[PDB]
Amino acid sequence: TTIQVIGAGLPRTGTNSMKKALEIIYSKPCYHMYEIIFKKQSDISIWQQLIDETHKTTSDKRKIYNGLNELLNGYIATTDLPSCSFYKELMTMYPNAKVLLTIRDKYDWLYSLRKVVLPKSTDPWKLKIEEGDQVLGIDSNFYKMSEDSLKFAFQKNHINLDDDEILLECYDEYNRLVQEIVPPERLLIHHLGDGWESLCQFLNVDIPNGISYPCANSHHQMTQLTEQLIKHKSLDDIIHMFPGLI
Ligand SMILES: Nc1ncnc2c1ncn2[C@@H]1O[C@H](COP(=O)(O)O)[C@@H](OP(=O)(O)O)[C@H]1O
Ligand SMILES: CC(C)NC[C@@H]1CCc2cc(CO)c([N+](=O)[O-])cc2N1
Ligand SMILES: [Ca+2]
Ligand SMILES: [Ca+2]
Ligand SMILES: [Ca+2]
Incomplete structure (x- = not known):
């Protein structure tokens, strides 16, 4: 099996629903971030x-292709970070x-x-995310990888991730760049809420x-999952509260 669909949309644009749809x-x-967090x-x-x-x-792009092939063996499609940031390399490979x-209103x-992925450094909710992650065995290595992959998507070496203007500018620029680089016949722009019709046609x-x-x-749902992880201290004992999660 080989990659048939490359998901270039950023996190929080409907990537998990698209994963499930594919x-x-x-x-x-x-593939999706939740393959990493919950399975690998x-x-x-x-x-x-x-x-x-x-x-x-x-x-060395060929070193990258080699690693991507290993990571994505057995999968027919990719979505979400970190894979979305590699859409150009995946297009060459496949x-x-x-x-x-996948795209949505930038302010939403x-x-x-901010609520799920990248809280600001001074948000007290950041501590709750960290505590619930600890329940999952997620440590600092994960945060470094997730942040570095978002910076690679945004083509920045350094950015103050607490700066909402920069994130909005980079979101708009990223989505524009996908449309500039991918030939339209090979690209479907799927707006949040669109459903099966346009995807199945494509x-x-x-x-x-x-x-x-x-x-x-x-x-x-992700906020409730964090709270329950912190209280109950086990994914398996709360997973039934989140049907269809993984
Ligand atoms: N069919 C669908 N219709 C509308 N919103 C959807 C949707 N599927 C996912 N979403 C929303 O897409 C976001 C998750 O995207 P991802 O899976 O990429 O992290 C969530 O937004 P909210 O956080 O605003 O609820 C989710 O509610
Ligand atoms: C389970 C919860 C208590 N904490 C883990 C959450 C799960 C959602 C999530 C999604 C993404 C992108 O899908 C990233 N990401 O790109 O770093 C990080 C996280 N972190
Ligand atoms: Ca480089
Ligand atoms: Ca600016
Ligand atoms: Ca529709």
């Missing part, structure tokens, strides 16, 4: 090595693969990112007859 369409796994934490250090290679002035860009995106499949388009991974 798994329905193809009956084969799709050993992938963190491999992604870090790939991201480190992007920091060099002249990255020239027949189609590219998705920023809030979602992928040359019928709409799945009696299956609703997924609506997964809301910030409310």
